[PDB]
Amino acid sequence: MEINPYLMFLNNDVTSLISTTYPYTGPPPMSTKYTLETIKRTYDYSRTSVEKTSKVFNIPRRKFCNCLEDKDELVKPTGNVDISSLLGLAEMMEKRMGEGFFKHCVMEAETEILKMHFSRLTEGRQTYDWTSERNMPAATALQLTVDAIKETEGPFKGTTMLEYCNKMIEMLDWKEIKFKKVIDSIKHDEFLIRALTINTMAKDGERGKLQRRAIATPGMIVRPFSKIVETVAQKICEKLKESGLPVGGNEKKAKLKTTVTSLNARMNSDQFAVNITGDNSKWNECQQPEAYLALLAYITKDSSDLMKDLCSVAPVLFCNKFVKLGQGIRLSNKRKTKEVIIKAEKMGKYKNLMREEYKNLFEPLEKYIQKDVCFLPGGMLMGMFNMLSTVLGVSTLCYMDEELKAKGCFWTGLQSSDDFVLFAVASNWSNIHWTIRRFNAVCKLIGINMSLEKSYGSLPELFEFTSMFFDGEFVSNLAMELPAFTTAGVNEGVDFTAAMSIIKTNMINNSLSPSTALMALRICLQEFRATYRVHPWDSRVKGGRMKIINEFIKTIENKDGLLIADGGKLMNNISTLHIPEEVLKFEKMDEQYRNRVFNPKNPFTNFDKENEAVVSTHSFRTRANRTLLNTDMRAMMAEEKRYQMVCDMFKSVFESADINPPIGAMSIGEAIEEKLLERAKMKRDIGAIEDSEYEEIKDIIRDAKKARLESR
């Protein structure tokens, strides 16, 4: 016999089985050629050749906004924008939502930008440090930038976001910047270029669209302005109904379902609808920051004179960005025995020993190039502006005209970033075709393209949107979320409850069936036992833990009360997935065991902080890596150790520093001293302290105060 699994698609639907296709049971698969190709495609899509010269950097500046030329093969992408059309679309969207709409949104945003503290820049994905020129986490990058400010001119007294932004602005006009290193200083031009730089990271954690194989990482002099723009963009996007970017899960499904009911109820007897599943292409390579600058200028037109100046920064900084070529080419001989390695700044030197492909791809981008960076004056990169792009995209789905109504035609739909669904309505196929072409035209006037291979259409109820297939029902693929049924990777206390919670939410939302949930529960339990090298008592496994387990097991009298990490069996099921095991077993442990486990003085317990779990001896922390032991990253560990010493002392005196954030008018030294003297009296009055000890303490403290105030 010959086997063919696809044959099951004849006598069955396809959505109710589409999850079977996803190969998510195996590992997903893991430069400069890529970045150079991206730079090239960006310069090409701008279908123009006009150029100016920047008096600042003295580099040719391709201007791609309102300069369309080369109007052939528009089916292919185009990255030129007609600001007039853009503003027309924005005005129609405002008219739909009512007046005073954009003003209200910028007001809500400004209400937050002002009170925000400048330490919320520590939270977020990696950033590109501009001193060592490498990717540090966001916390460390912020620390280093602040340290540079302080060592150059004076300590940063600021405490809010606006003050940090003003300091950044000023730093673009200094003339010599200092910073620490194994205390180098630099000039203005070099630092300017080093600030506008942008780097790339190959994380692309989610599989999703295989096209995503990189992500951007701007510096720390560009982070606060980007946050400002994104805050206003979010405040706008949440209000619209034709957008699905901020929402998640049941929300976007409910949106689609109400949309379909509304559509079927509106259209008359002589009209029929059609749906389309679209996937725009080259999304981050056609979005232009100049159009964003014009649009943000139109939005913040009636608001305060402060927002008009803040929102306009991130656009110009992205209008003048430099990109980073990574790791350069590699040279080698025939046998491949030897091998020379070369970097970006040098590829301009050995440009004759490279493949003809690199030469055709590199020499054209040789004038835009500077030392190991390229001056990309437009385009975009992944992840930079998602909500703003969704707003710009949703402005189209709102279009309406006299011609569309003279024929009784109208479209709607729903868009998240570069992924949309369209619902066209008309009375005849000649007009369905005409409407679809009209939509495509209005989208081309502002750089929103459409992929002709990945896009398809059909009669009303069959479409897809972000891996969610829709028909009369909704097929929760349930393979999209399969990888999550694995030990999270925190500690023993947590992982089992975390896994049970994931199974529960799936049963509620994605319609995972009962028996499947039981199977997933058993599989996760086995994987947990395998990870932490532990097994039941009744089993015969040998090894480190099982040794002491079997040794002391005799002291127990009710094994039903043991924990899984101690050779315990499973007592949990579908109807008790919302209950941690420590709670489900507490009434049966042995007082001896129970008290030795839930003891607060453990050399192991650490708190993590969502964290719906119980804390006990099993809540440990793993060792810290040691590769750095060899790397000469120790000078930086020094300053970290200093901050840690200060903080742990302050907390030693005040126990609620972590729970309740401190406030007050004292500095830290003042508060510490005052509290120590107060506690000394409080004890010496009644508690076990002598006048000799009290006087010694007071003398120590006064000397410490003298030293603190004397150093400077």
Binding site: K157, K257, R266, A624, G669
Partner: protein, 553 residues
């Protein structure tokens, strides 16, 4: 004691340094928070991979050193290692150890005197367990389920508070010496603080853990979920084991957690004071605020002020709305027209004037909105999605489950939109006496028709007839509605569609500051009325338990 002296010596050594002195001198204390981030920052991409690859080592865990010596935890108990003298790179005051060491502690380690305090630290989860044990399951059955999506609460919680009222409560119960000035919430809720304090005092505890758990004990976890059947926190907490799209695990869970009883008590009290204050003619505003602040009520064990519960609840009812409005409490954007509930999805408009003749010629002004708007609407067990256009009910879809509810929902929508000729030429039955002014207070023609419908069923039948009736076209036989509320017929009403399957309640995490008039009708930055006193029941007698109306009236 000696520890205090050690802390003093540590502070001195630290001040001897130069940078530490500058950082402990500049700015206020808030900097602590900032410094807490610049240190110990390190993450990992795939913690699962690194857990299976880290636990495969010899000494993968860290642990305290002095705590192990004091506990006399040996090394190499039975030829199996437990730890070794070293220094983790980050802490520098911790020592590597192995997982087996944890088991050693749990089996032959130091024991605390008692640990029943745990049941209090984790009251919410032992509460889940206890409520579960008192459920009586039933057979399991298979069928399709009508799951509507909506926002609900999943955590049964007594005395739901705000966040500012917890951050302080976490201090007077745990860190009292470091407590701030007494806030109003404390001085008022004294017994509550005393209660939480009696349990966690003179006990061996880790306090960070206890503080986090208190935040969890006072949080109604609000979620946007698909839902079926009654809506009660006791069910929503275990919805996963009651039904899916194709099955139902029958079980009776009616007598547990007593939540909605408190809410219905609160609404009864609110209706009482609203009507009382309405009895006035010139001070209903100040009268109402005074009646509110002059009242109290019992919740479980504690005594709470009414004005404090009203600013904590989320009952979108035409009574709670008025009170929350008098007290300057912000609220959600949900409308209310009589018994039904409403929520706007899109559209706009503005007021416009029109007139109608009651009997013969008697001009009476009534307003309407001049634009198109789209609305979700909710009556008992029936949902609808409709649209109005310039004094007309353009279209409507329904997803209810009863004929009576379908007819009533359709009728109240027609009234809400001023659709029909009756708004063009009122019926003979109504007169100037029934018009308005029980005692002088006028009544817009809308609520006039409303009560005219609620009076007799035949008025409702006539109003539905006001809607065009036609012959059921082919194919549409299933999606059609007669006058009785039947899913199909030969002749059905005009521009109406039925369906099985409720409509998804819209959602918006928005808040609005409204106000009200001397007639107790709230407005929202527009001529639209979100609440009033004509949309609530006429009257009824009730015996309130554990209430205090310490006010003369």
């Amino acid at each position: 004691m000696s520890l205090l002296l050690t802390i003093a010596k540590e502070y001195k050594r630290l001040c001897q340094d130069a940078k530490a002195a500058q950082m402990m001198t500049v700015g206020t204390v808030s900097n602590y928070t900032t410094f807490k981030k610049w240190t110990t920052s390190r993450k990992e991409k795939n913690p699962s991979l690194r857990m299976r690859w880290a636990m495969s080592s010899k000494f993968p865990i860290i642990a305290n050193k002095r705590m192990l010596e004091e506990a006399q935890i040996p090394k190499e108990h039975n030829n199996v290692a437990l730890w070794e003298d070293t220094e983790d790179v980050s802490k520098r005051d911790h020592v590597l150890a192995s997982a087996s060491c944890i088991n050693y502690w749990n089996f032959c380690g130091p024991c605390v005197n008692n640990s029943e305090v745990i049941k209090e630290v984790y009251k919410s989860r032992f509460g889940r367990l206890e409520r579960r044990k008192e459920i009586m399951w039933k057979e399991l059955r298979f069928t399709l389920v009508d799951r509507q999506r909506r926002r609900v609460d999943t955590q049964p919680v007594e005395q739901r508070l705000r966040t500012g009222e917890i951050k302080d409560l976490q201090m007077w119960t745990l860190f009292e010496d470091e407590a701030p000035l007494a806030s109003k919430f404390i001085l008022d809720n004294y017994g509550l603080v005393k209660e939480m304090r009696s349990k966690f005092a003179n006990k061996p505890l880790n306090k960070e853990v206890v503080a986090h758990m208190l935040e969890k004990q006072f949080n109604p976890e609000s979620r946007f979920l698909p839902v079926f059947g009654a809506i009660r926190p006791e069910r929503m907490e275990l919805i996963h084991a009651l039904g899916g799209e194709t099955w139902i695990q029958e079980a009776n869970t009616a007598g547990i957690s007593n939540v909605d009883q408190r809410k219905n008590d609160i609404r009864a009290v609110c209706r009482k004071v609203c009507l009382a204050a309405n009895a006035s003619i010139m001070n209903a505003k100040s009268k109402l605020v005074e009646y509110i602040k002059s009242t109290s009520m019992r919740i479980g064990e504690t005594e709470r002020k009414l004005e404090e519960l009203i600013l904590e609840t989320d009952d979108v009812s035409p009574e709670v709305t008025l009170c929350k409005s008098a007290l300057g409490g912000q609220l959600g954007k949900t409308l209310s027209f009589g018994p039904m509930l409403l929520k706007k999805i899109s559209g706009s408009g503005v007021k416009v004037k029109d007139t109608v003749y009651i009997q013969g010629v008697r001009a009476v002004q009534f307003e309407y909105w001049s634009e198109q708007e789209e609305f979700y609407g909710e009556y008992k067990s029936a949902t609808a999605l409709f649209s109005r256009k310039e004094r007309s009910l353009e279209w409507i879809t329904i997803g209810g489950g009863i004929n009576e509810d379908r007819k009533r929902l359709l009728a109240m929508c027609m009234i809400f939109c001023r659709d029909g000729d009756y708004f063009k030429d009122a019926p003979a039955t109504i007169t100037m006496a029934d018009l308005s002014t029980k005692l002088g207070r006028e009544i817009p023609y809308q609520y006039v028709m409303m009560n005219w419908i609620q009076k007799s069923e035949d008025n409702l039948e006539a109003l539905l007839y006001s809607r065009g009736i036609v012959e059921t076209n082919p194919g549409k036989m299933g999606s059609s509605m007669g006058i009785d509320g039947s899913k199909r017929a030969i002749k059905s009403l005009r521009a109406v569609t039925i369906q099985s399957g409720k409509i998804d309640m819209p959602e918006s995490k928005e808040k609005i500051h409204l106000e009200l008039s001397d007639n107790l009708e709230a407005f929202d930055s527009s001529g639209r009325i979100v609440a009033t006193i004509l949309d609530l029941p006429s009257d009824k007698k009730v015996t309130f338990q554990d209430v205090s109306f310490q006010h003369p009236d």
